[PDB]
């Protein structure tokens, strides 16, 4: 319980894969590390587990330094993608395996195995051998071993990637109810943002080894710190329009839309380090675009793609005011054929603004679900 | 080249993986076979391509019988996860325009077969890649049969979707027909992001094009649902289906269902709420756009929209909904 990373760094030769990670994981917290493949998610969990050495920095688990502690003496349990079960043990044996080495009454053993067995949809396979199960079933068995063991700290490296879409959904639900009941510290890694939003108490976004941002789900969604975070968090990606600053004021920045459309708009974002003439990036999420019974800033274009998902419609629009096609989301079924002329509004209070260095001008509009000043 | 299956069946001893499969795939149609792992998706693809044999029934790649024809002569190209990377230059520079998959396109196969191509790619990459596949099909109208376990890809890519359930065709139709008018509980629970809610109900009346059921609450309120009454007998026990996105806010009321909040998931673009209605087991899942601020344990009320409810018989078959939904012909 309780994990602290103080300037933890990792490097292979002259390549740095983990750069000065600073994290304070509180006891019982559910922390998700997210980012694309190659950003250093597994290397980080492996350093916590003691399966990789820490180049520099200190790692604390339960207040004690663990840099030099052997894997099995750190109080952690780890599960990962396509875990290999012991071929000669029965499902039940593979699930109680961790708890047995750690010593424990058979009473506690069977109690947990049975419980975890139900939760993970495996109570009927208890007596079979792993060779007789599906890839989805073995993975669940692997997850179960650690859940039965109940280590002081759970480390899960993309544990659900081996499951059908439907099973991932149910497993996420089960992982959540398990964390609530056990209250144990859990560090979970995924490349999937939806999963991070759903499971995490707090999320840490990794970008090629660096911590881009750490915060609650909504803190990342409403107030991303840079373009990377803004475009990583949010099912269908945030729209980005290249803009040019034309004026600045107290807690306010004005920009001009690109290409032909040269319309100027005021955005309620901090002017801190913004300078007239700066080429910047304007961000607006598909779900945040308005339907246009006049919003005072309108973009009109030609439908390129239309996705009917039943619960909602995702329209791809080509704006004559030239760029990349403006994705729009609206609830329920929206009737429009791929070719029509669709017009949507652009709400200033919902716009994000990124400098050339990618950093963001702090939005000042107050969003629900995130602690705000005043 | 259109593909067609006539009572196709496959069996490995006493195990039948394909049960009387009847499929009509028109040329230049984007078809997706969806279903859980083990349902027979790969077996079908391989029978069409000839890498496996058809136990009974007939396979037509356009107009012909490929049942007994070597693979290298059916003219069907396949693709899996990742790749083993005057005319040759004109076709390549040509296929390079509409756009690996391209090597297959350049071979100009009669039908394009894809077996879970987005399988092991990052989530965000899967999203980009399918937008890509759709574009590739928009510009190049060849015949494509895509196989996956993920309902999202099916709803997003296919012109026509075929849901497979343990070797049998549960249903065939466009994305919105399957979403709006699922034929059975299996299809109703498979297609759709967070799963459709199912409530055990007991019928207490019928009529022409209309069935009345009572809800499991100590309120046992009775409601009229616009579904065909063909095979409904008063007093019968059935399952009432209602999607999370289709439940009503409150404000509109009209049917209420109130309970205690169990779980709240803030996803930014929407809020998913799990409510425990003091009556039934299994929390009810509710979805509402944007951010909803409710604590766990708080009381929350929602509404049931009659014309949006599905009704299933004890055998899982659905009572064809009659409410007209925009997007589907009939
Ligand atoms: N033993 C190693 N030697 C050199 N580079 C490594 C080693 N292990 C991982 N890496 C580098 O780190 C990245 C992948 O591991 P991480 O553990 O970063 O994976 P991911 O975040 O995709 O799960 C790549 O940039 C890879 O080259
Ligand atoms: N050669 C084979 N012998 C016996 N059973 C097979 C064979 N190939 C596939 N199956 C059966 O078919 C199912 C998996 O293949 P399908 O080809 O059904 O896969 P999926 O739909 O998961 O892609 C399992 O029920 C499996 O036992
Ligand atoms: Mg990894
Ligand atoms: Mg398969």
Residues of A in contact with B191 (CB under 8 A): 310
Three-state secondary structure call for residue A90: coil
- The Cα angle at residue B119 between residues B114 and B121, in degrees rounded to 5: 125
Contact B143, B76 (CB under 8 A): no
Residue numbers after which chain A is interrupted (C to N above 2.5 A) read none
B198 inside 8 A of chain A by CB: no
User: Method used for this model?
Assistant: X-ray
Measured distance CA(A223)–CA(B288) in Å, rounded = 21
Measured distance CA(B176)–CA(B155) in Å, rounded = 8
- A165 and A262 co-located in one domain: no
What DSSP line would sit under A150-174, residue for residue? --SEEEEESTTTTS-HHHHHHHHHH
With CA atoms as reference, report the closest residue to A370 among B264, B266, B300.
B266
Give A253's strand partners.
Answer: A248, A267
Measured in Å, residue B161 CA sits from the centre of ligand 4 at 16
Give the rounded distance of the alpha carbon of B132 from its chain centre: 21
Contact B70, B50 (CB under 8 A): yes
Place of tokens 């939806």: A194
Looking from the CA of residue B43, the nearest atom of ligand 2 is 17
Measured in Å, residue A157 CA sits from the centre of ligand 3 at 7
- B84 and B188 co-located in one domain: no
A324 inside 8 A of chain B by CB: no
Which of B119, B149, B173 is at the close of a domain?
B173
B222 inside 8 A of chain A by CB: no
In a domain, A372, yes or no: no
Residues of A in contact with B180 (CB under 8 A): 310
Which of B128, B155, B173 is at the close of a domain?
B173
Query: Given B135, B287, B291, which is nearest A369 (Cβ)?
Result: B291
Q: What is the CATH number of the domain that holds A334?
A: 2.40.50.140
What is the maximal distance between C-alpha atoms in chain A?
Answer: 75
DSSP A314: E
Measured distance CA(B19)–CA(B301) in Å, rounded = 45
In a domain, A82, yes or no: yes
Measured in Å, residue A42 CA sits from the centre of ligand 3 at 4
- A114 and A243 co-located in one domain: no
Three-state secondary structure call for residue B117: coil
Q: What is the CATH number of the domain that holds A150?
A: 3.40.50.300
Contact B238, B205 (CB under 8 A): no
CB contact under 8 A, B156 and A309: yes
Domain housing B149: 1-173
Looking from the CA of residue B39, the nearest atom of ligand 2 is 21
Measured in Å, residue A37 CA sits from the centre of ligand 3 at 6
Is any atom of ligand 2 closer than 6 Å to the C-beta of B55? no
Three-state secondary structure call for residue A325: coil
**In the structure, how many helices (H) and strands (E) does chain A have?**
8, 19
Contact A354, B278 (CB under 8 A): no
Tokens of B191: 């297609």
Alpha helices in chain A (DSSP H): 41-49, 91-101, 106-119, 135-149, 165-182, 193-199, 217-222, 227-232
Judged on CB neighbours under 10 Å (0-12, 13-18, 19+), A264 is middle
- B169 and B220 co-located in one domain: no
Tokens of B194: 């967070």
CB contact under 8 A, B293 and A236: no
With CA atoms as reference, report the closest residue to A36 among A153, A208, A162.
A208
- B123 and B154 co-located in one domain: yes
User: Residue B143's CB: how many other CB atoms inside 10 A?
Assistant: 23
Q: What is the CATH number of the domain that holds A270?
A: 2.40.50.100
Contact B275, B284 (CB under 8 A): yes
Tokens of A310: 């039943």
Tokens of A263: 């319309």
Number of domains within chain A: 3
Residues of B in contact with A312 (CB under 8 A): 245
CB contact under 8 A, A164 and B326: no
Q: Between A and B, how many residue pairs show a Cβ–Cβ distance under 8 A?
A: 107
Tokens of A145: 């071993």
Cβ partners under 8 Å of residue A373, min gap 6: none
Pocket test for ligand 1, best of A13, A41, A43, A78 (most atoms within 8 A of CB): A43
User: Residue A131's CB: how many other CB atoms inside 10 A?
Assistant: 9
- What's the resolution in A? 2.3
Residue nearest to atom 13 of ligand 2 (CA): B38
CB contact under 8 A, A164 and B180: no
Judged on CB neighbours under 10 Å (0-12, 13-18, 19+), A62 is middle
Contact B58, B8 (CB under 8 A): yes
Place of tokens 């329209």: A315
Residue nearest to atom 8 of ligand 2 (CA): B43
Place of tokens 């939003």: A197
With CA atoms as reference, report the closest residue to A197 among A225, A219, A226.
A219
Residue B40 marked as a ligand binder: yes
- The Cα angle at residue B38 between residues B146 and B316, in degrees rounded to 5: 95
Measured distance CA(A12)–CA(B147) in Å, rounded = 40
In a domain, A110, yes or no: yes
CB contact under 8 A, A169 and B195: yes
In a domain, A368, yes or no: no
For B260, list phi and psi in degrees, rounded to 5: -105, 135
Measured distance CA(A348)–CA(A340) in Å, rounded = 26
Three-state secondary structure call for residue B20: strand
Measured distance CA(A189)–CA(A32) in Å, rounded = 5
Tokens of A224: 């991303």
* Pocket, ligand 1, Cβ cutoff 6 A: A 12, 17, 37-43
Cβ partners under 8 Å of residue A111, min gap 6: none
Place of tokens 């028109």: B26
Q: Indicate which ligand has the atom closest to the C-alpha of A158.
A: 3
- B160 and B55 co-located in one domain: yes
Contact A162, A168 (CB under 8 A): no
Q: Indicate which ligand has the atom closest to the C-alpha of A41.
A: 1
With CA atoms as reference, report the closest residue to B148 among B299, B58, B10, B36.
B36
- B101 and B21 co-located in one domain: yes
Is any atom of ligand 2 closer than 6 Å to the C-beta of B17? yes
- B184 and B323 co-located in one domain: yes
Tokens of B125: 């990459």
Judged on CB neighbours under 10 Å (0-12, 13-18, 19+), B96 is exposed
- B161 and B15 co-located in one domain: yes
Place of tokens 């939005």: A363
In a domain, A85, yes or no: yes
- B23 and B162 co-located in one domain: yes
Three-state secondary structure call for residue B118: coil
Measured distance CA(A310)–CA(B155) in Å, rounded = 8
| Interface list for B 130-169 with A (CB within 8 A) | 131, 134-135, 138, 149-152, 155-156
Residue in A closest to B293 by C-alpha = A369
Tokens of A231: 């475009």
Residue nearest to atom 10 of ligand 2 (CA): B17
Q: Indicate which ligand has the atom closest to the C-alpha of B13.
A: 2
Measured distance CA(B69)–CA(B72) in Å, rounded = 8
- A228 and A245 co-located in one domain: no
Measured in Å, residue B39 CA sits from the centre of ligand 2 at 8
- B159 and B208 co-located in one domain: no
Kindly list the distances between the CA atom of residue A113 and the CA atoms of A143, A145, A261, in Å, as whole numbers in the listed order. Answer: 12, 8, 64
Contact A35, A205 (CB under 8 A): yes
Is any atom of ligand 2 closer than 6 Å to the C-beta of B80? no
Residue in A closest to B273 by C-alpha = A198
**In the structure, how many helices (H) and strands (E) does chain B have?**
7, 18
DSSP B196: P
Contact A255, A280 (CB under 8 A): yes
Residue list for the binding site of A for ATP:
35-42
SS3 of B122-162: the string is: CHHHHHHHHHHHHHHHHHCCCEEEEEECCHHHHHHHCCEEE
SS3 of B229-288: the string is: CCCCCCCCEEEEEECHHHCECCCCCCCEEEEEEEEEEECCCEEEEEEECECECCCEEEEE
Give the rounded distance of the alpha carbon of A227 from its chain centre: 15
Tokens of A340: 């029509």
Give A254's strand partners.
Answer: A247, A266
Which strands make up the sheet holding B237-242, listed edge to edge?
Answer: B222-225, B211-214, B197-205, B237-242, B310-312
Per the document, the length of chain A is 374
Query: Given B180, B291, B327, which is nearest A335 (Cβ)?
Result: B327
Beta strands at B197-205 and B211-214: parallel, antiparallel or unpaired = antiparallel
Is any atom of ligand 2 closer than 6 Å to the C-beta of B37? yes
Q: What's the first-to-final CA gap in chain A, in angstroms?
A: 35
Measured distance CA(A94)–CA(A133) in Å, rounded = 13
Q: Give me the half-sphere count of Cα atoms (radius 13 Å) on the Cβ side of residue B142.
A: 22
Kindly list the distances between the CA atom of residue B280 and the CA atoms of A67, A177, B277, in Å, as whole numbers in the listed order. Answer: 51, 19, 6
Tokens of B83: 């790749």
Query: Given A165, A190, A221, which is nearest B268 (Cβ)?
Result: A221
Residue B259 marked as a ligand binder: no
């Amino acid at each position: 319980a309780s994990v602290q990373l103080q300037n933890v760094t990792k490097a292979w030769g002259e390549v740095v894969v983990s750069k000065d990670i600073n994290l304070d994981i509180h006891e019982g917290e559910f922390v998700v590390f997210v980012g694309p493949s190659g950003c250093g998610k597994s290397t980080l969990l492996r350093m916590i587990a003691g399966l990789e050495t820490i180049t520099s920095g200190d790692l604390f688990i339960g207040e004690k330094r663990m840099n030099d502690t052997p894997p099995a003496e750190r109080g952690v349990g780890m599960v990962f993608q396509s875990y290999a079960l012991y071929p000669h043990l029965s499902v039940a044996e593979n699930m109680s395996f961790g708890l047995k080495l750690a010593g424990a009454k058979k009473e506690v053993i069977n109690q947990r195995v049975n419980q975890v067995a139900e939760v993970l949809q495996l109570a009927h396979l208890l007596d079979r051998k792993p060779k007789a199960l599906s890839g989805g079933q073995r993975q669940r068995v692997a997850i179960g071993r650690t859940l039965v063991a109940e280590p002081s700290v759970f480390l899960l490296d993309e544990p659900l990637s081996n499951l059908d879409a439907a099973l991932r959904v149910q497993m996420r639900i089960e992982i959540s109810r398990l964390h609530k009941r056990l209250g144990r510290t859990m560090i979970y890694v995924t490349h999937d943002q939806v999963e991070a939003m759903t499971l995490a108490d707090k999320i840490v976004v990794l970008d090629a080894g660096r911590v881009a941002q750490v915060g609650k789900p909504l803190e990342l969604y409403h107030y991303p710190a840079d373009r990377f975070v803004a475009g990583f968090i949010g099912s269908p990606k945030m729209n980005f329009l290249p803009v040019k600053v034309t004026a600045t004021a107290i807690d306010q920045v004005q920009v001009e839309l690109p290409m032909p459309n040269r319309q100027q708009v005021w955005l309620p974002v901090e002017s801190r380090d913004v300078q007239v003439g700066a080429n910047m990036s304007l961000g607006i999420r598909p779900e945040h675009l308005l339907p246009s019974d006049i919003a005072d800033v309108i973009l009109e274009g030609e439908v390129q793609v239309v996705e009917q998902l039943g619960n909602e419609t995702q329209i791809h629009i080509q704006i004559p005011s030239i760029r990349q096609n403006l994705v729009y989301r609206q609830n329920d079924v929206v009737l429009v054929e791929e070719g029509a002329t669709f017009a949507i509004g652009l709400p200033p209070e919902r716009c994000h603004l990124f400098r050339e260095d990618g950093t963001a001008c702090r939005r000042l509009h107050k969003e629900p679900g995130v602690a705000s000043a005043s």
